[PDB]
Amino acid sequence: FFEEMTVYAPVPVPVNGNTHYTSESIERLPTGNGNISDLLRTNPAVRMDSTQSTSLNQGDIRPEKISIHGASPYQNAYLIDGISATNNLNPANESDASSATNISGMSQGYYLDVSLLDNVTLYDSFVPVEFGRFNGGVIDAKIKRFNKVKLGYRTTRSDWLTSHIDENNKSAFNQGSSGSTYYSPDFKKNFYTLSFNQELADNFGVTAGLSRRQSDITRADYVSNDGIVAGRAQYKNVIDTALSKFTWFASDRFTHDLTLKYTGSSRDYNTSTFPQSDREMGNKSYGLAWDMDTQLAWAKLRTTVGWDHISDYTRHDHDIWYTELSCTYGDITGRCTRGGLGHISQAVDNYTFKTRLDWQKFAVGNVSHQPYFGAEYIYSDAWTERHNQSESYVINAAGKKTNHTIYHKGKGRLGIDNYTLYMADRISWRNVSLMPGVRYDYDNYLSNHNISPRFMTEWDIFANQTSMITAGYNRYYGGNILDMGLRDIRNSWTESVSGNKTLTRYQDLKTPYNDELAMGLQQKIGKNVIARANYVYREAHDQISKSSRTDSATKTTITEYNNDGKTKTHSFSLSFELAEPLHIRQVDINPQIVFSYIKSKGNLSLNNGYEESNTGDNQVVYNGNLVSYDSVPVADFNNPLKISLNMDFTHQPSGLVWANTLAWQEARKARIILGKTNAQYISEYSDYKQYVDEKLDSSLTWDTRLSWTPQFLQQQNLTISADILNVLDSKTAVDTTNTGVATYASGRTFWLDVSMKF
Ligand SMILES: CCCCCCCCO[C@@H]1O[C@H](CO)[C@@H](O)[C@H](O)[C@H]1O
Ligand SMILES: CCCCCCCCO[C@@H]1O[C@H](CO)[C@@H](O)[C@H](O)[C@H]1O
Ligand SMILES: CCCCCCCCO[C@@H]1O[C@H](CO)[C@@H](O)[C@H](O)[C@H]1O
Ligand SMILES: CCCCCCCCO[C@@H]1O[C@H](CO)[C@@H](O)[C@H](O)[C@H]1O
Ligand SMILES: CCCCCCCCO[C@@H]1O[C@H](CO)[C@@H](O)[C@H](O)[C@H]1O
Ligand SMILES: CCCCCCCCO[C@@H]1O[C@H](CO)[C@@H](O)[C@H](O)[C@H]1O
Ligand SMILES: CCCCCCCCO[C@@H]1O[C@H](CO)[C@@H](O)[C@H](O)[C@H]1O
Ligand SMILES: [Mg+2]
Ligand SMILES: [Mg+2]
Numbered sequence: 061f062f063e064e065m066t067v068y069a070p071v072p073v074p075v076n077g078n079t080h081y082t083s084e085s086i087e088r089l090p091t092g093n094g095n096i097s098d099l100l101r102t103n104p105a106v107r108m109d110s111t112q113s114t115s116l117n118q119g120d121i122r123p124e125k126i127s128i129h130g131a132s133p134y135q136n137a138y139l140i141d142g143i144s145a146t147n148n149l150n151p152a153n154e155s156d157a158s159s160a161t162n163i164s165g166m167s168q169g170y171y172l173d174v175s176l177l178d179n180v181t182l183y184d185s186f187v188p189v190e191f192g193r194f195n196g197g198v199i200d201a202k203i204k205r206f207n208k209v210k211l212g213y214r215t216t217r218s219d220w221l222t223s224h225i226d227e228n229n230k231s232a233f234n235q236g237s238s239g240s241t242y243y244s245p246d247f248k249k250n251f252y253t254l255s256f257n258q259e260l261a262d263n264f265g266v267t268a269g270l271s272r273r274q275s276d277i278t279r280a281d282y283v284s285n286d287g288i289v290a291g292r293a294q295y296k297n298v299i300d301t302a303l304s305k306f307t308w309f310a311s312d313r314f315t316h317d318l319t320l321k322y323t324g325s326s327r328d329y330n331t332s333t334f335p336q337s338d339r340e341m342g343n344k345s346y347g348l349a350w351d352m353d354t355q356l357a358w359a360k361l362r363t364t365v366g367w368d369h370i371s372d373y374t375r376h377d378h379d380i381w382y383t384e385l386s387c388t389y390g391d392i393t394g395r396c397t398r399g400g401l402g403h404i405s406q407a408v409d410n411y412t413f414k415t416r417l418d419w420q421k422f423a424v425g426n427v428s429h430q431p432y433f434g435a436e437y438i439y440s441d442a443w444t445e446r447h448n449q450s451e452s453y454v455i456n457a458a459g460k461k462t463n464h465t466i467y468h469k470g471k472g473r474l475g476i477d478n479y480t481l482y483m484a485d486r487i488s489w490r491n492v493s494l495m496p497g498v499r500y501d502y503d504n505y506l507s508n509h510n511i512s513p514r515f516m517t518e519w520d521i522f523a524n525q526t527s528m529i530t531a532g533y534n535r536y537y538g539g540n541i542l543d544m545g546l547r548d549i550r551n552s553w554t555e556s557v558s559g560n561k562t563l564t565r566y567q568d569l570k571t572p573y574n575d576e577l578a579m580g581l582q583q584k585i586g587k588n589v590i591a592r593a594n595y596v597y598r599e600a601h602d603q604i605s606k607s608s609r610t611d612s613a614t615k616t617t618i619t620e621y622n623n624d625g626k627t628k629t630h631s632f633s634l635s636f637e638l639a640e641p642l643h644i645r646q647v648d649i650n651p652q653i654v655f656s657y658i659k660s661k662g663n664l665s666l667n668n669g670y671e672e673s674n675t676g677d678n679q680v681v682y683n684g685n686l687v688s689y690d691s692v693p694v695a696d697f698n699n700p701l702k703i704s705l706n707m708d709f710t711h712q713p714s715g716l717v718w719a720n721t722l723a724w725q726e727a728r729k730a731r732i733i734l735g736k737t738n739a740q741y742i743s744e745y746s747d748y749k750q751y752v753d754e755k756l757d758s759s760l761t762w763d764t765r766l767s768w769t770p771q772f773l774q775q776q777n778l779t780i781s782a783d784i785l786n787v788l789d790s791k792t793a794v795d796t797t798n799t800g801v802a803t804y805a806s807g808r809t810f811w812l813d814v815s816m817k818f
Contacts, residue, residue, distance in 0.1 A: 061430065061486050061488070061493065061495075062076050062493050062495075062516075062518045062530070063493065063518060063520050063525055063528055064076060064528075064582070065525070065528070065582045065584070065590050065592075067080075067637065068590070068637060068638065068639055068640075068641075068650070069590075069635070069637035069638075069650065069652040069706065070088075070089075070650050070651075070652050070706040070707065070708040070719065070721075071085075071089070071102050071652060071654065071704070071706045071721065072085055072102075072103075073103070073104060073592060073633070073635045073637075073654060074103065074104065074105055074182075074184055074185070074580075074592075074594055074633065075582070075592070076186055076516070076518070076530055076580065077183060077184055077185035077186030077187060077516070077530075077532075077578065077580070078181060078182065078183045078184070078186070079103055079105075079181070079182045079184070080179060080181050081099055081179060081180040081181070081182070082179050083177065083178055083179060083204075086099060086174050086175065086177065086179075086180070087175070088708070088717065088719050088765065088767075089102070089719060089721070089765065090719065090721075090763045090764065090765040090783040090784075090785060090811065091174060091175075092783075092785065092809075092811070093121045093122075093123075093273065094173050094174045094175050094214075094251070094273070095121075095122070095123040095124065095168075095171065095172075095173075095174065096123060096138075096168070096172060096174055096180060096199055096201065097123050097124040097125070097126055098124075098174065099174050099180055100126055100180075100182060100199070101126075102654075102704070102721065102723075103182060103184070104594075104633035104635070104654055104655070104656030104702065105128055105129055105182075105184035105185070105197065105596065105631060105633065105656075106126050106127065106128060106182075106184075107126075107127045107658055107697040107698070107699065108124060108125065108126060108127070108697065109124070109125050109127075109133070109666075109667065109696055109697055110699060110725075110728055110792075110794040110795075110805060111696075111794050111795040111803060112124050112125060113806070114794055114795075114803050114804060114805060114806060115222075115223040115224045115225055115803075115804045115805065115806050115807060116223070116225065116229065116233055116243045116244070116803065116804075117242065117243055117244050118218075118221050118223075118244055118247070118806055118809070119218075119243075119244025119247035119275050119277035119297060120242075120244065120275070120277075120297060120327075121249065121273050121274075121275045121297055121299055122166070122171055122299070122325060123166060123168045123171050125166070125167075125667075125697075126197075127196065127666055127697035128182075128184050128196030128197030129184060129185065129196055129197070129574075129576070129596050129598045129629055129631045129658070130196075130598050130600065130627055130628075130629025130631070130658065130660035130662075130694065130697075131194075131195040131196025131197070131574060131598065131600060131629075131666075132195065132196070132603075132666040132667075132669050133151075133167060133666060133667070133669075133697070134151040134152055134167050134541075134669045134670070135194055135195030135196045135538050135572070135574075136167060136194055136196050136197050136198070136199060137191060137192070137193055137194035137197075137198045137199070137539070138167065138168050138169060138170075138199045138201075139191075139198065139199065139200045139201070140170065140172075140200075140201050140203070140319075140321055140349075141200070141201070141202055141203055141319060141349065141351070142190070142200060142364070142414075143347075143349055143364060143366050143368070143412055143414075144169075144193070144368070144410060144412070144438070145168075145169040145170050145201070145321075145345070145347075145368065145370075146167060146168070146169050146193075146539065147165055147166060147167055147168065147169040147343075147345075147370050147372070147408070148167075148408065148539050148540055148541060148542055149165060149370070149372065149406045149407070149408055149442065149541075149542050149543060149546070150163070150165050150372075150406065150541065150542070150543035151165055151166050151167040151541075151669070152541075152667075152668070152669040152670060152671050153165055153543075154166060155240060156240055156241070156242050156327075156329060156341060157239075157240030158240070158329070158331060158337065158339055158374070158376065158400065158401065159401065160401045160404070160450060160452075160465075160467045160553075160554060161404065161547075161550050161551065161554075162374060163372045163373065163374050163404060163405070163406050164341050164343075164372065164374070165343065165372040165406070166343075169323075169345050169368070169370040170301075170321060170322075170323035170345045170370075171299045171301075171323045171325050171343065172201055172301055172303075172323055173251075173253065173269075173271035173273060173299070173301040174201075175212065175253055175271065176253065176255055176269030176270075176271050176301055176303055177201050177202060177203070177204075177269075177303075178202045178203060178204035178205075179202045180199065180200065180201050180202070181199075181200045181202065182197060182198070182199055182200075183197055183198040183200070184196075184197045184596070185532075185534070185576060185578040185580075185594075185596045186516040186530065186532050186534065186578060186580075187514070187534060187536065188484060188495070188497065188514060189434070189482035189483065189484045189497040189498065189499040189512070189514045190416065190434055190482060192480065192482075192499055192501055192512065192536070192537065193501065193537070193538060193539035194536055194538060194539065195536055195538045195572055195573065195574045195600060195603075196536075196574070203267065203269075203303055203304075203305045203319055203321075204255075204257065204267040204269070204305065205267065205305060205307045205317070206257040206258065206259060206265030206266060206267050206305075206307055207257055208255075208256060208257050208817065208818070209254075209255075209256045209817070209818040210253070210254070210255040210256070210815060210816070210817055210818075211253070211254055211815065211816045211818075212251075212252070212253035212254075212255075212813065212814070212815040212816075213250075213251070213252060213253075213813065213814045213815075214249075214250075214251035214253075214811065214812070214813040214814075215248075215249055215250055215251065215811070215812055215813070216249045216809065216810065216811045216812070217247065217248045217249065218244070218245065218246045218247050218248075220809060220810035220811075221806065221807065221808075221809045221810075222786075222789055222806075222807030222808045222809070223804075223806075223807060224791045224792075224804035224805070224806075224807050225804065226801050226802050226803070226804075228799075228801045229801065229803075231287065233245050234280075234289075235279065235280045235283050235289060235332055236277070236278070236279020236280055236295075236332065237279060237332055242277075242279070242329060243279070244275075244277045245278065245279065246277070246278035246279075246292075247275050247276060247277045247278065248275070248276045249273070249274070249275045250274050250276075251271070251272070251273045251274070251813075252271065252272045253269075253270070253271045253815075254268075254269075254270045254271075255267075255268070255269045255270070256268055263308065263309040263310070264306075264307070264308045264309075265306070265307060266304060266305065266306045266307075267303075267304065267305050268302075268303070268304045269301065269302070269303040269304070270301065270302055270303075271299075271300070271301040271302075272298065272299075272300050272301075273298065273299045273300075273301075274296065274297065274298040275297040275298075276294045276295070276296055276297070277294075277295045277297060278292055278293070278294055278295070279292065279293065279295055279330075279332070280292055280293075280332050281293040281330060281332070282332060282335060283332035283333055284392075285394065293330075295327070295328040295329060295330070296326070296327070296328050297326075297327045297328070298324075298325075298326050298327075299323065299324070299325045299326075300322070300323065300324035300325075301322070301323055301324075302320070302321075302322040302323075302324075303319075303320070303321055303322075304319065304320040304321075305317060305318070305319050305320075306318040306319075312355060313354055313355055313356070314352060314353070314354055314355075315352070315353040315355075316350070316351065316352055316353075317349075317350070317351035317352075318348070318349070318350055318351075319348065319349040319350075319351070320346075320347075320348060321345070321346060321347045321348075321349075321368070322345065322346040322347075323343070323344075323345050323346075324342075324343075324344050325342050325343040325344070326340060326341075326342040327340070327341050327342060328340055328341075329341055331397075333397065334381075334396075334397045334398055334399070335389045335390070335392070335396065335398050336377065336378050336389070336398050336399050336400070337376075337377075337378070337381075337398070337399065337400055338376070338377035338378075338400065339374060339375065339376040339377060339400055340374075340375045341373075341374050341375075342372070342373055342375070343371065343372045343373075344369075344371050344373070345368065345369060345370045345371065346368070346369055347366065347367055347368030347369060348366065348367050349364060349365070349366040349367075349412075350364070350365045350366070351363070351364050352364075357420070358419065358420050359417050359418060359419045359420060360417070360418040361415065361416070361417055361418075362414075362415070362416040362417075362418070363414065363415050364412060364413070364414040364415075365412070365413060366410070366411070366412035366413075366414075367409065367410070367411055367412070368409065368410045368412070369407060369408075369409050370407060370408050370409075370410075371405055371406065371407035371408075372405065372406050372407075373403070373404065373405035373406070374403070374404050374405075375402075375403040375447075376399075376400025376401055376402055376403065376450075377400055378398075378399040378400035378401075378402075379399070379400065379401070379402040379448055379449070379450050379451070380399045380400075380401075380450065380451050380452070381397070381398075381399040381400055381401045381450070381451075381452045382397070382398060382399055382451075382452060382453050382454065382455055383395060383396070383397045383453075383454045383455070384396050384397075384398065384455055385454065385455070385456050385457065386456070386457040400450075401450040401452065401467060402446070402447065402448040402449070402450040402467065403446075403447035403448055404444070404445065404446050404447065404550070405444070405445050405447065406443070406444045406445075406543075406546065406550075407442070407443055407444075408440055408441070408442040408443075408542060409440070409441040409442075410438050410439070410440050410441075411438065411439040411440075411441075412436070412437075412438050413436065413437040413438070414434070414435075414436045414437075415434060415435045415436070416432065416433070416434045417432060417433045417434070418430075418432045419431045419432065419433075421486075426489060426490070427487060427488070427489045428486075428487070428488040428489070429485055429486065429487055430485070430486035430488075431483065431484065431485040431486070432483070432484055432485075432486075433482065433483045434480065434481070434482040434483070435480065435481055436478075436479065436480035436481075437477075437478070437479055437480075438477075438478040438479075438480075439475070439476070439477060439478075440474075440475070440476040440478060440542075441473065441474075441475060442473070442474040442476065442542040442545075442546060443471060443472060443473040443474070443546070444471070444472055444546045444547075444549060444550045445470070445471040445472075446467060446468065446469055446470045446471070446550070446553050447469070448469060449466065449467065449468060449469050450466075450467035451464065451465065451466050451467065452464070452465040452467075453465070463557070464556070464557075465554065465555065465556035465557075465559065466554075466555045466556075467553055467554060467555075468553040468554075468555060469553075470549070470550075470552070470553045472546055472548075472549025472550065474505075474542065474545050474546060476503055476504060476505045476540075476542075477503065477504050478501075478502070478503045479500075479501070479502045479503070480499070480500065480501055481499070481500040482497070482498070482499040482500065483497060483498060484496065484497030484498075484514065485497070490523070491519065491520040491521075491523040492517070492518075492519055492520075493517065493518040493519075494517050495514075495515070495516050495517070496514075496515050497513070497514035497515065498511065498512070498513055498514065499511075499512040499514060500512075501537055501571075503540060505540045505542075505545070506540060506566075506567060506569050506570075506571060507567075508569075508570065508571045510537040510571050510573075511535075512534070512535045512536065512537055513533070513534070513535055514534045514535070515532055515533050515534065516530060516531075516532035516534070516578075517530070517531055517532060518530045525584075526583070526584040527581075527582075527583055527584070528581070528582040528583075529579070529580070529581055530578075530579070530580035530581075530582075531578070531579050531580075532576075532577075532578050533575075533576070533577055534575075534576045534578075535573055535574070535575055535576075536573060536574045536576065537571045537572075537573045538571060538572045538573065541604070541670050544564050544566040544621060544670075545564070545566065547562060547564055548561070548562050548563065548564050558615075559615070560610055560615055560616055560617045561615065561616055561617075562616065562617050562618075562619065563616050563617070563618045563619070564619050564621070565618065565619065565620040565621060566621040569604065569621055569622070569623060570602040570623045571602070572600070572601070572602050572603050572604050572623065572625075573600075573601055573602060574598050574599065574600050574601070575598070575599045575601065576596060576597065576598050576599075577596075577597040578594070578595065578596045578597065579594070579595045580592075580593070580594045580595075581593040581594070584639075587639075588638050588639050588640055589636060589637070589638065589639075590636075590637045590638070590639055591634075591635065591636055591637075592633070592634070592635040592637075593633070593634050593635075594631075594632070594633040595630075595631065595632050596631035596632075597629070597630055597631070598627075598628075598629045598631065599626075599627075599628055600625070600626060600627040600628075600629070600662065601623075601626055602623035602625075602626075603623065603624075603625025603626060603627065603662075603664060603675075604621055604622070604623060604625060604669070604670035604672075605621070605622055605623075605624050605625040605664060605670070605672040605673060605674075605675035605676075606619050606620060606621045606622065606670065606671065606672070606673055607619075607620055607622065607673060607676060608620070608673070621670065622675070624663075624675035624676060625662070625663060625664040625672060625675045626662060626663060626664075626675075626690055627660055627661065627662030627663075627664065627694060628660070628661050628662065628690070629658065629659065629660035629661075629694075630657075630658075630659050630660075631657075631658050632655075632656070632657040632658075633654070633655065633656050633657075634654075634655035634656075635652070635653070635654050635655070636652065636653040636654075637651075637652045637653075638650065638651060638652075641708075646711060646712065646713055647709055647710070647711050648708075648709070648710040648711075648712075649707065649708070649709060650707070650708040650710075651705070651706070651707050652704075652705070652706040652707070653703075653704070653705055653706075654702075654703070654704040654706065655701075655702070655703055655704075656701070656702040656703075656704075657700060657701050657702070658700055658702075659693070659700050660693065660694040660697075660698070661690060661691055661692060661693055661694065662690060662692075662694045663675050663677065663689035663690050663692070664694070665694070665695050665696050666694060666696050666697050667696050667697075674689075674749065675689075677689050677748070677749055679748055680692060680748055680749050680750065680751060681734075681742055681745045681748050681749070681750035681751070682750075682751055682753075683751075683752060683753060684740065684742065686745055686748065692751070693729070693753070695729070695731040698728045698729060699725045699726050699727070699728045700726050701725070701726035702723065702724070702725050702726070703723075703724045704721060704722065704723045704724070705722040706720065706721050706722070707720045707722075708720070713771075714768075714771070715768055715769035715770060715771045715776070716766070716767070716768055716769075717765075717766075717767040717769075718764070718765075718766055718767075719764065719765040719766075719767075720762065720763075720764045721761075721762070721763045721764075722760070722761075722762050723759075723760075723761045723762075723763070724758065724759070724760050724761075725758060725759045725761070726758055727755050727756045727757050727758045727759075728755075728756055728794070729753040729754060729755050729756070730753070730754045730756055730795055730796045731751050731752075731753055731754075732751065732752050732753075732754060732798055733749065733750070733751055734750040734751065734752060738750075740752055754796060756792075756793045756794070756795075756796060756802075757791075757792045757793040758792070759790050759792035759805060760788060760790050761785075761786055761788075761790060761805075762784075762786065762787040762788050763783075763784070763785050763786070763787070764783070764784045764787055765781060765782070765783045765784075766781065766782045766784075767779055767780075767781040768780050768781070775817065776817070777816055777817045777818065778814070778815075778816055778817075779814070779815045780813075780814055781812075781813045781814075781815075782810065782811070782812055782813075783809075783810070783811035783812075783813070784808065784809070784810055784811075785806065785808070785809040785811070786805075786806060786807055786808050786809060787808065788808075789807050789808040790805070790807075791804060791807070792804060792805040793805075
């Protein structure tokens with residue numbers, strides 16, 4: 061509806077607030093593990109946490125965190141075919157640790173292998189009324205409709221990866237861990253894909269995508285008090301993906317779709333120091349969706365009936381975790397800790413009922429109107445469970461148990477009703493396009509009536525589509541964190557002597573939101589250059605943070621959640637591309653320059669999210685100065701300037717495609733909290749928290765993918781590809797400890813993949 065200059069460049073970029081990633085572009089770009097986060101790292105609206113996936117943990121194949129326009133990584137709406145696929149149970153808890161209540165999770169409900177998706181669409185700004193419950197952006201994964209059998213093999217290993225490690229981390233890295241932080245010294249990645257589409261009957265068919273991504277990380281199974289490794293074992297990390305879509309083109313009026321979705325993540329861990337501490341930590345999501353499109357003469361009606369199960373779990377091998385003062389395990393003699401703390405889980409089931417009505421285009425004088433309305437109902441069943449009774453204790457040689465704790469078999473469930481109403485009008489007069497809209501959200505979890513005004517306007521300045529300006533104002537209200545209401549039930553299962561149970565105060569919370577002011581320019585320079593300039597301003601208000609206290613008499617820790625967090629972020633992007641690529645001796649060259657600049661100031665850390673507790677600090681000492689906390693730069697997802705030269709080489713006679721991305725990223729600042737002993741500390745300001753920012757290293761990263769399709773074979777069935785990540789083997793310090801011990805980004809990495817079509 062809005063006029064747009066299509067992206068012919070190597071890397072997709074934001075057009076009118078949205079970026080489209082086709083399967084061609086997902087396959088052409090080197091995407092590592094093939095998680096949606098690998099696809100979106102190149103987007104100028106996105107910032108990753110460079111301290112997350114480092115030289116120390118390339119074995120892990122799970123999806124990574126993404127910040128859109130300064131928003132936190134738990135504030136994005138992840139959807140599959142327009143249906144919510146976001147894990148709102150407790151996305152901030154990523155800890156791989158073992159405990160009675162620890163469960164590792166993230167915001168992505170399904171860890172989807174992107175190589176099976178038809179396309180992925182990211183909305184970063186000018187987001188329409190249909191999308192909601194997010195503070196930063198919307199990621200919409202789309203499933204292919206029948207239109208072919210493809211087999212794909214992809215592999216990599218620790219031998220093909222260069223690890224830049226500080227000498228201080230060498231021992232922990234070789235063992236495979238340091239307490240609850242796990243490393244991947246030795247690993248082998250085998251990824252298998254199977255995709256097919258088959259017409260089953262007249263106007264009826266199905267598409268099925270299956271993917272098994274496995275990483276076998278080798279660590280020490282047992283480490284002694286001395287630090288002596290006794291043996292090594294293989295810890296299976298696997299993500300299974302199963303996607304399927306049935307389409308029945310029943311008639312001119314009706315079209316039916318039935319979608320089956322399933323992602324199975326499973327990771328084996330153990331505590332090196334504790335014998336018999338094996339545990340399976342995982343995440344399982346599956347669901348169904350019946351879509352129906354009814355075409356009438358005056359309007360189009362789209363209905364969706366859906367069910368999704370999103371879960372995370374910890375399943376120890378053992379049910380008892382205990383400390384023997386005189387060890388009876390194997391040949392261990394001293395004090396030893398053995399076992400595990402059973403099986404726990406957390407889940408949310410959504411029952412979705414959506415409707416959208418698209419009225420036919422009509423005129424009121426010379427002003428063209430195309431309105432649309434939506435109504436949605438989502439029932440959420442959210443729960444946490446302790447599957448088996450567990451115990452902990454210290455036992456003496458005689459058999460006397462002390463410091464005994466019992467974890468009781470239990471389950472706690474929550475029922476939530478979510479409603480959505482929305483309407484927008486597509487207004488078009490001459491060279492001006494207008495889309496005014498309003499979205500309404502209500503839930504009985506926080507019981508807040510949320511009104512989101514949504515407005516974007518586009519002006520074709522000369523009406524020849526050479527200069528187009530887009531401006532807009534939009535409000536984005538986020539979703540809920542179900543842990544707040546569920547944790548107390550999980551903490552009540554604990555029966556111990558001096559254990560503080562929890563009381564969580566959250567029902568008076570206002571829903572967190574972003575106000576956005578955005579301006580976009582699409583400009584044709586000369587005959588062959590397309591230039592895109594975008595500015596996005598985001599004010600993040602009523603951001604969730606907390607404060608706590610422990611009460612002795614009642615033996616309770618009272619956490620009171622609040623809306624004290626606030627950030628201001630300025631986002632700028634400048635892109636240059638060619639309408640026509642160069643042609644030299646049959647080699648087609650497609651070049652692109654992308655500038656991305658994101659500066660954010662706030663009184664919180666994005667990684668902390670709703671668990672942030674320092675928002676009550678109105679003032680801080682920052683780099684020797686007593687300043688307002690809101691004026692201080694945000695400490696994470698903080699590499700402000702990004703400059704990229706992207707270049708695709710295509711030589712059809714030889715069946716070769718050469719994709720290259722050269723990315724220069726600005727150094728991030730590592731925040732350090734100063735103690736009274738610190739040389740830079742100021743006693744004058746002792747009543748305030750004091751921080752110093754240490755700038756680290758900038759990174760020049762060259763990622764490449766060389767794809768060969770042997771021309772001798774009829775139908776071009778076979779394709780062999782090589783991916784090289786960080787070709788220059790840049791050594792970049794992503795993070796540093798208080799002592800000065802540095803964490804490094806990953807070094808040169810080689811990926812080999814084969815695909816056969818039939
Ligand atoms: C398509 C994938 C081709 C892989 C070719 C082998 C990659 C070699 O990889 C290199 O090997 C060196 C010696 O073993 C190591 O020192 C380097 O760290 C490693 O990057
Ligand atoms: C219909 C089945 C579709 C997927 C086919 C690929 C499954 C690969 O499966 C893998 O095979 C390996 C064989 O060496 C085993 O060692 C692994 O444990 C297994 O996960
Ligand atoms: C998961 C989908 C459930 C619906 C069952 C599939 C019905 C397919 O029905 C098909 O419809 C065609 C007309 O559209 C006819 O020409 C075919 O003979 C008939 O098999
Ligand atoms: C596609 C389905 C469209 C949305 C259906 C809206 C149903 C509204 O239902 C109403 O919700 C109120 C709020 O909890 C309740 O107080 C009322 O008792 C209930 O009937
Ligand atoms: C949170 C308490 C109700 C849980 C849902 C139970 C089964 C569906 O009952 C729902 O009740 C709502 C009223 O609250 C209505 O708005 C819905 O239309 C109705 O489907
Ligand atoms: C078509 C969509 C209809 C649903 C709109 C949401 C109406 C929310 O309405 C609210 O319902 C609560 C009960 O759950 C009451 O406590 C509130 O007083 C009432 O304002
Ligand atoms: C398509 C490009 C649009 C350019 C928009 C104007 C430049 C925005 O610039 C911003 O202005 C703010 C004003 O208070 C300052 O606070 C920011 O530091 C500054 O970066
Ligand atoms: Mg290596
Ligand atoms: Mg309330």
